């Protein structure tokens, strides 16, 4: 079910010492790769430094991303006008049933999707004027179209397979959460219950509230990452003061054989 996805970003006038362009590469919700226009080199992130990886893998990455850098910084020439720009791209692929890849290639300008890459016609598309401009600049190039094709239909899925084999260790990692449930006097005759999940991987996880064994739904959920690739979650609920000890909190998660009841 997992997927290789690159998060390309360029800006037209960067705060100085900031990079004009940069990429983050992801395997599922793990960041494996990292690149930017200053350093100019694709580097492994996190536990992926220790991946049993082959020679030339990384400089293949670098080579590809440099073509991307050029393309992206080229886009702002095509747009012409003054006002600062932010060009984003989401590129990748996901494995499908029959030893089959499914590609993704969308882009956004100043925070709105506007352009895409049609893998059938081998053309960029989108119909905003901005997208027509950029689409045109790229389509008339040293076979930029072909390289995007190879990158998505060949390189991407070949990489994805390679990482699955050589990086099971990371991908299949499992860490169940530490749980805490607490009561916080809030209002007049009210109080806030907060269930919290600490340090878990993978990030799929649900929090639920019971009140004497019957569902009180969920309230506001919150979800986030820790420094170490693990995750954090919390859910909160309004509740009659003095009626607190009646509630508990239940948690579902891949790293637990069965759902956990969490007392106050």
């Amino acid at each position: 079910h997992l997927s290789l996805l690159y998060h390309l970003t360029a800006v037209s006038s960067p705060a100085p010492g900031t990079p004009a362009f940069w990429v983050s590469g992801w395997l599922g919700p793990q960041q494996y790769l990292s690149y930017n226009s200053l350093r100019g080199e694709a580097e492994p992130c996190g536990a992926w430094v220790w991946e049993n990886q082959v020679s030339w893998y990384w400089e293949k990455e670098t080579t590809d991303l440099r073509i991307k850098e050029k393309l992206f910084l080229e886009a702002f020439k095509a747009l012409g006008g003054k006002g600062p720009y932010t060009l984003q791209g989401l590129l990748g692929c996901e494995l499908g049933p029959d030893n089959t890849s499914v590609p993704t290639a969308k882009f956004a300008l100043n925070g709105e999707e506007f352009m895409n890459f049609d893998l059938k016609q081998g053309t960029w598309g989108g119909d905003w004027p901005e997208a027509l401009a950029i689409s045109q600049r790229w389509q008339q190039q040293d076979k930029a179209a072909n390289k995007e094709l190879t990158f998505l239909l060949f390189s991407c899925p070949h990489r994805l397979r390679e990482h699955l084999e050589r990086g099971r260790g990371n991908l299949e990692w499992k860490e169940p959460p530490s749980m805490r449930l607490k009561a916080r006097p809030s209002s007049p005759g009210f109080s806030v219950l907060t269930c919290s999940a600490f340090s878990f991987y993978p990030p799929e996880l649900q929090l639920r509230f019971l009140r004497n064994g019957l569902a009180a739904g969920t309230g506001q959920g919150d979800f986030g990452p820790n420094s170490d690739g693990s995750f954090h979650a919390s859910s909160s609920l309004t509740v009659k003061s003095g009626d607190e000890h009646h509630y508990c909190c239940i948690v579902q998660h891949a790293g637990l054989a069965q759902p956990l009841r969490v007392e106050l």
Binding site: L79, G81, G83, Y85, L109, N110, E112, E113, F114, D127, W128, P129, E130, A131, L132
Partner: protein
């Protein structure tokens, strides 16, 4: 009685061009000097939002405060007929005045642009009138420009639309240039921008022939 409210749409060019900002505005005049504070709200297809940006008090000669609230809507949004709203509440108003604006909804129609050169008769004189008829389009909102030799043109005017019998609208644009220029052959290109335009944009051309 109390103050009144006026709710303006975004700029048609700004609703196609991302690079530009499509501002859905909320202007309230005839406001009480005594009770100046006003509580704006906003509702996207019913759902409230908190990305409003209120400009400060811009008082007039007529002792009435004038206040303005700008919402930066999305591009894609507006064009999907998402229904917006300005809920103004003031102590100078007993109840709240609500004003609901949108895209002029309905099946939009591809415009159809043709150029027309200056007529026989006209050419005699030093000046000419390069016509741009644009017909067969829905809706009203539409941007029209001129440009020559890769470079925009100033000397022109463009009539607003009128409703064509068929239900769609149409428009004209009278770019004037000097005779010499037109004779020299220089290619002129009437540019149009509109919702149903393929790529939200098309331009046509006009030259000696």
């Amino acid at each position: 009685g109390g103050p009144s409210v006026f709710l303006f749409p975004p700029k048609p060019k700004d609703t196609l061009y991302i690079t530009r900002e499509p501002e859905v505005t909320c202007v309230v005049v005839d406001v009480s000097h005594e009770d100046p504070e006003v509580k704006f709200n906003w509702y996207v297809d019913g759902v409230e939002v908190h990305n409003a940006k209120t400009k400060p008090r811009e008082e007039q000669y007529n002792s009435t405060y004038r206040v303005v609230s700008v919402l930066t809507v999305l591009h894609q949004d507006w064009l999907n007929g998402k229904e917006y709203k300005c809920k103004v509440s003031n102590k100078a108003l007993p109840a709240p005045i609500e004003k609901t604006i949108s895209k002029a909804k309905g099946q939009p129609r591809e415009p159809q642009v043709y150029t027309l050169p200056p007529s026989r008769d006209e050419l005699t004189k030093n000046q000419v009138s390069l016509t741009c008829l644009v017909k067969g389009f829905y809706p009203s909102d539409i941007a029209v420009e001129w440009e020559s030799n890769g470079q925009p043109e100033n000397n022109y005017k463009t009539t607003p639309p009128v409703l064509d019998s068929d239900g769609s609208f149409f428009l004209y644009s009278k770019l004037t240039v000097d005779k010499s220029r037109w004779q020299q052959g220089n290619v002129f290109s009437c540019s149009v921008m509109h919702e149903a335009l393929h790529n939200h944009y098309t331009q046509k051309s006009l030259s000696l022939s």
